[PDB]
Amino acid sequence: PGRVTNQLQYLHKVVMKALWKHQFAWPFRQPVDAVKLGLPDYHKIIKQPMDMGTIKRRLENNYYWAASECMQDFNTMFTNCYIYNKPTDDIVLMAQTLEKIFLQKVASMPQEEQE
Amino acid sequence: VTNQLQYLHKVVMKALWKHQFAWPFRQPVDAVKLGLPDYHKIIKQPMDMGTIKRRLENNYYWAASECMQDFNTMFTNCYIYNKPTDDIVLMAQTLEKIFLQKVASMPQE
Ligand SMILES: CC(=O)N1c2ccc(-c3cc[nH]n3)cc2[C@H](Nc2ccccc2Cl)C[C@@H]1C
Ligand SMILES: CC(=O)N1c2ccc(-c3cc[nH]n3)cc2[C@H](Nc2ccccc2Cl)C[C@@H]1C
Predict the structure, then answer these.
(1) Ligand 1 centre distance from Cα of residue B42 (Å)
(2) What radius of gyration, in Å, describes the C-alpha atoms of chain A?
(3) CATH of the domain at A12
(4) Which parts of the sequence belong to the Bromo domain (chain B)?
(5) Is A71 helix (H, G, I), strand (E, B) or coil?
(6) Domain count, chain B
(7) Is A91 close to ligand 1, i.e. is its CB under 6 Å away?
(8) Quick check: B29 and A74 in contact, CB under 8 A?
(9) I want to staple B39 with a disulfide (CB 3.0 to 4.6 A). Which of A54, B31, B70, B85 is the partner?
(10) Which domain holds residue A83?
(11) Is B27 on the interface with A (CB under 8 A)?
(12) Which residues of A16-26 are buried (b: 16+ CB within 10 A; e: fewer)?
């Protein structure tokens, strides 16, 4: 099903920890609530919702088999934001800022995955 | 030249450049050719694979994360500018997943 690996530990304790506490992270810590936000078209446009709270819970429950699977969920979270929102929305700039940190930290992840 | 930039050139760019969905991304967006008079009003930092490839060939980058940010900007511009239902968005998503899969095995500095 899933494993604990050196890389998944790094994504959890180093990458996710740094993104979670960021001042721009608050819109991303829980699923988009289309009802609360009054976005009745959100789920007609975005077919795979994702958020850091869901990723964090997956990391804690050993859901992922490999680091790449977790990285793809981070990517989906950011990509959903760019696809749905207007280019001028502040949330787009917040996602871009977080995504740059994600890439910087991923650049220093351990090279070979080990259980 | 670093270990990581060599990986980005020999593994990541090699895989992306020859991909069957790469052709819209191999040269800068030509807004005149494509009839997109608002492209440069929305997208303020254009980026494309031909530019990244030339920068790798020319030892332009000082750190691997700089190259990774250019890949990211190229994909993000596509998501921001295009309509969600445009095929180019699916093509970018496919290429970006390959990018992330390969970056998962990139060496450390
Ligand atoms: C991530 C994302 O895609 N979105 C999202 C998700 C959650 C929240 C949220 C959580 C708690 N309160 N509001 C807000 C937003 C964005 N709205 C927004 C963002 C920043 C400033 C002002 C606004 Cl209006 C819309 C968009 C659909
Ligand atoms: C990457 C990107 O953002 N775009 C882009 C860039 C270059 C090209 C291109 C190069 C040579 N010929 N066409 C086309 C496109 C997209 N168009 C498009 C893509 C696939 C199928 C049909 C169409 Cl209409 C629009 C969008 C603005």
Answers:
(1) 21
(2) 14
(3) 1.20.920.10
(4) 1-106
(5) helix
(6) 1
(7) yes
(8) no
(9) B31
(10) 1-115
(11) no
(12) beebbeeebbe
